Every structure is written in C-alpha cells, then in structure tokens.
Amino acid sequence: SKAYYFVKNFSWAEVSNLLCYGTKYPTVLNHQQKVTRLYRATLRRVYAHQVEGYKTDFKQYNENITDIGKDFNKMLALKPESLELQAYFKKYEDLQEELFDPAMIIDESRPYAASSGRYYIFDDY
C-alpha cells in the first residue's frame, strides 16, 4: 500500500475506503476481494490497537479477533446483494473509523512513509 492517506488531499470517504480496502473505489472489487480486504484491514487495526498498544491485553485481543473471524466467515458466506452483508460492512467500516488514529505507525517498507525516499539511487547511465 502506498500509505498516502494523509497526503494528496483525500476526503474522509476516500481515506476510509483506502483504509478498509486497498482501493479508493471499492465498487470495482468483487465480493471475495471486498470481504478479504476488509477482514485484513480489521485484523491489522485490531493488532495495532490491542497488541502493539498501551497496556495491551492479549486475552481480550484473542477474544476480539475470534469474534471478528466468525463474523467475517458469515459475511463471506452471505450473498453480495444482502442487507445483512451491507450491515456487516457498515459495522466494520464504523469500527475502522472508530479505531482511526492520526499519526498511526506507518511501516518503513511502504511508499510515502517516513524515510521512504531519503536517498537518491544513481542509475547506470
């Protein structure tokens, strides 16, 4: 991921789409892509807040991830055009918004991160 959420004048909706799914236009994604990307984003955020956080509780982390995994299994089973699946997507998008942290840790291996382009590599030319 390019990790350019806070740059390029993204609106809140675009930033939320980028966080939940790798794309800014989730409509292009299919059902499996949407579900898998949302599950990955939810697990990443839960890990960031309840493993690498302030006085994290690993038992609570385990319970939370288990519940999320069961819910996402049900979501994947559900059909794309279902109000229940829409409610699940809205719930977890709201969870992502709730856990949104300004100045959240951005890994140095991603573009646009701190230290991303500190050096200019000279070409064979």
Binding site: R118, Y119, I121, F122
Partner: peptide, 8 residues
C-alpha cells in the same frame, strides 16, 4: 544501522 551503501 545506517542505509546500505550504493555506488556514486
């Protein structure tokens, strides 16, 4: 620690 050295 530091960045990997590259040709200049």
């Amino acid at each position: 620690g530091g960045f990997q050295k590259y040709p200049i």
